């Protein structure tokens, strides 16, 4: 049953600029609150932004913010704090300040894989990320091929676009890419 | 642990 998820926001202009950040909240919110009760109870949930002005997490990488760390158990009070930071950061951040021109995505994605790694240890857990972009094409990494034997985390793309990145997904089982537009089902 | 430090090191 037990469960990890990390999920990857991407804040790059184009995510910002299309309401793919907005979206992915509001889809956040959805799950989040829609989780079980046996479920808030056993799993983890945490944050990161990639392509990102604010630096701060574990390893002090450039352009790669954790805002939120680790969460358990999940319960509504610890969600909707999670969604309330989420919502200051755009708020905070809707009048563009400095993100033009940011690539952390690969290094966002390796230090989720070290506070992963750090956080779990020996646990018999199932660990996710979650990973919200446009840009399937920006992941800077035979690079593959030491995750892919590094990585015992399995990676859900979601692509908010209307490569490198399918490369990875092959690469690591268990592994799936969805349209936004397939997430939840419109009503018509 | 250490292959990932040091391949995170590389890109940065």
């Given at each position: 049953?037990?469960?990890?998820?990390?999920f990857?926001?991407?804040?790059?202009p184009?995510?910002?600029?299309?309401?793919?950040?907005?979206?992915?909240?509001?889809?956040?919110?959805?799950?989040?609150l829609?989780?079980?009760?046996?479920?808030?109870?056993?799993?983890?949930?945490?944050?990161?932004?990639?392509?990102?002005?604010?630096?701060?997490?574990?390893?002090?990488?450039?352009?790669?913010?954790?805002?939120?760390?680790?969460?358990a158990?999940v319960?509504?009070?610890?969600?909707?704090?999670?969604?309330k930071?989420?919502?200051?950061?755009?708020?905070?951040?809707?009048?563009?300040?400095?993100?033009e021109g940011?690539?952390?995505?690969?290094?966002?994605?390796?230090?989720?894989?070290?506070?992963?790694?750090?956080?779990?240890?020996?646990?018999?857990?199932?660990?996710?990320?979650?990973?919200?972009?446009?840009?399937?094409?920006?992941?800077?990494?035979?690079?593959?091929?030491?995750?892919?034997?590094?990585?015992?985390?399995?990676?859900?793309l979601?692509?908010?676009?209307?490569?490198?990145?399918?490369?990875?997904?092959?690469?690591?089982?268990?592994?799936?890419?969805?349209?936004?537009?397939?997430?939840?089902?419109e009503?018509? | 642990?250490?292959?990932?430090?040091?391949?995170?090191?590389?890109?940065?």
């Amino acid at each position: 049953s037990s469960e990890s998820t990390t999920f990857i926001v991407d804040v790059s202009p184009s995510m910002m600029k299309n309401n793919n950040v907005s979206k992915s909240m509001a889809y956040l919110e959805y799950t989040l609150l829609n989780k079980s009760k046996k479920s808030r109870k056993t799993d983890w949930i945490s944050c990161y932004l990639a392509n990102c002005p604010v630096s701060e997490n574990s390893q002090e990488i450039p352009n790669v913010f954790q805002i939120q760390s680790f969460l358990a158990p999940v319960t509504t009070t610890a969600t909707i704090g999670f969604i309330k930071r989420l919502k200051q950061y755009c708020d905070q951040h809707s009048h563009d300040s400095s993100n033009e021109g940011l690539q952390s995505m690969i290094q966002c994605l390796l230090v989720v894989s070290l506070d992963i790694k750090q956080q779990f240890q020996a646990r018999k857990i199932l660990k996710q990320i979650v990973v919200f972009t446009d840009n399937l094409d920006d992941l800077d990494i035979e690079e593959i091929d030491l995750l892919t034997e590094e990585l015992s985390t399995r990676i859900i793309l979601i692509d908010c676009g209307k490569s490198n990145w399918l490369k990875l997904v092959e690469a690591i089982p268990n592994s799936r890419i969805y349209n936004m537009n397939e997430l939840l089902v419109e009503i018509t | 642990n250490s292959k990932l430090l040091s391949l995170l090191r590389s890109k940065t």
